[PDB]
Symmetry: C2
Subunit: 306 residues, 2 copies
């Protein structure tokens, strides 16, 4: 028992991190097979980032201007190309530690683990969600660009995020591994405002199920509701609307606990309207929304990887 | 910027986990050099755990009754011995993935990362603290015994915890890697009550410094206090007393921010007495106490490992 915000074991990803230097700019790259992926703004100076024309800047770079180091050993760059907002550097050596992998573009509300790196070296691992405004709330200091987010399914790593930017408000933006930004953001140092950061309702409900499974039961009430009635309350509190697809996804947690999804919605409605009155759920005084229904099933049943 | 509960990258520890089976009991072991460490209750049945005499139970086991599997490959056990509450199984092969390591016994308030494992396979990684009552609040399901907690300093893994027990209240107890329990707990299925779980004051203060560094400033007030005056309030709220040693440890955070430690104590005193009034700090509605002062310096400056 117990319930923790848990990241995926990071070993398979640690073996893929390298340092990429272009001129005086160093950040992280991801080495899979004989390709290294990194943010294209490795080619920029601090001055360039105010208004970069990446195609024109890239004309001035050749393979030998990209310095790639894996541990203490230099890799030879034999080609380079730009795809959307990422650079692909072809090297002459396949990474011997390449895991089974795929590239996925996730949806808001999905969770993943981030391996924060500096100078190609892993610093730490944590779990976060893609927010509904397509930002993440991470922990990234200068030098962390090119750190990646991932999920693992048994032995296959699904890479879903590469870190590129901190907005002036201190939240984070980045791309999938095809180089397309999540959200409307661009890799330029300009004013970019994020939209409303709504709470991910289906994740809150999953976490309430986890709470019941682990013995935190005080918030269960005598009421039920309907989807439409619940969504009227959700909208008032800047919660995402719940759909029947979400209800279907929570089915296994409902069956395990015997608490109908709409009954749990009515418990959540009363927590929104009355508050927590100074009590906690699973050690939180807020309603937690960075566990998906699959995260809860996984942690509550003990799924493993290798 | 941003501030996250972050675990150490787990790769160096993933390479050390194995499955140990004795009879019908399977749990995790730690393979370092040519020794595998596991909880001694691997030799028990469910019935035995009510009142085990481990020396008498162990007389009935020989090397070949201990089945050790690393991945898909069986290891040959050539000796076994019991040290306190751990079994040491000598194998005929040194783990080729053995990292630089040490065994440390930590103090309450210290934080470490847990690699939760089942059947020798890593499931997830999370960060926790040793509570002042010598329990941890983990996420452990049946089969997770023998999972370990660790800290990393550059390239050296310091192992500090091995998981053995869940108390009837749902909190967790275990040993250092010499097999000595943290706290008064024993490896028997009997009623064992935990003492007061007080809040780790020096960790709260460190986290308030992290909040200031990252721009959460609303709780800073116009007051100061003294150690003795603060400790009178701390005792009333089941906070650990603050000592000059703690003040000394917070010195670098005080110097960086320009906020004297006793001034921060006075801010904390007003948060304890008045509450948060519905606001948050670093995304929490509680006062967080599982970051040490070293955790904060580390994360706020970007220290790496390899
Ligand atoms: Zn950057
Ligand atoms: Zn056990």
């Amino acid at each position: 028992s117990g319930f923790r915000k848990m990241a995926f074991p990071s070993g398979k990803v640690e073996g893929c991190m390298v340092q990429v230097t272009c001129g005086t700019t160093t950040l992280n790259g991801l080495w899979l097979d004989d390709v290294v992926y990194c943010p294209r703004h490795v080619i920029c100076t601090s001055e360039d980032m105010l208004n970069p024309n990446y195609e024109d800047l890239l004309i001035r770079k050749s393979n030998h201007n990209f310095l790639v180091q894996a541990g203490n050993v230099q890799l030879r760059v034999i080609g380079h190309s730009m795809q959307n907002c990422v650079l692909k550097l072809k090297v002459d050596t396949a990474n011997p530690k390449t895991p089974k992998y795929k590239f996925v573009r996730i949806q808001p509300g999905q969770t993943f683990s981030v391996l924060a790196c500096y100078n190609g070296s892993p610093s730490g691992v944590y779990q976060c969600a893609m927010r509904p405004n397509f930002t993440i709330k991470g922990s990234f200091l200068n030098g962390s660009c090119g750190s990646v987010g991932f999920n693992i399914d048994y032995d296959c790593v699904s890479f879903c995020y590469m870190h590129h930017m901190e907005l002036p408000t201190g939240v984070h933006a980045g791309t999938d591994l095809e180089g397309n930004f999540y959200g409307p953001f661009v890799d330029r140092q300009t004013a970019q405002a994020a939209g409303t950061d709504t709470t991910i309702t289906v994740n809150v409900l999953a976490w309430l199920y986890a709470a019941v499974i682990n013995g935190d039961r005080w918030f269960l009430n005598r009421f039920t509701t309907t989807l439409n009635d619940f969504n009227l309350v959700a909208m008032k509190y800047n919660y995402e609307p719940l759909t029947q697809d979400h209800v279907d996804i929570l089915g296994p947690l409902s069956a395990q606990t015997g608490i109908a999804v709409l009954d749990m919605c009515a418990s959540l409605k009363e927590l929104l309207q009355n508050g927590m009155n100074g009590r906690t759920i699973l050690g939180s005084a807020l309603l937690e929304d960075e566990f998906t229904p699959f995260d809860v099933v996984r942690q509550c049943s003990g799924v493993t990887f290798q």
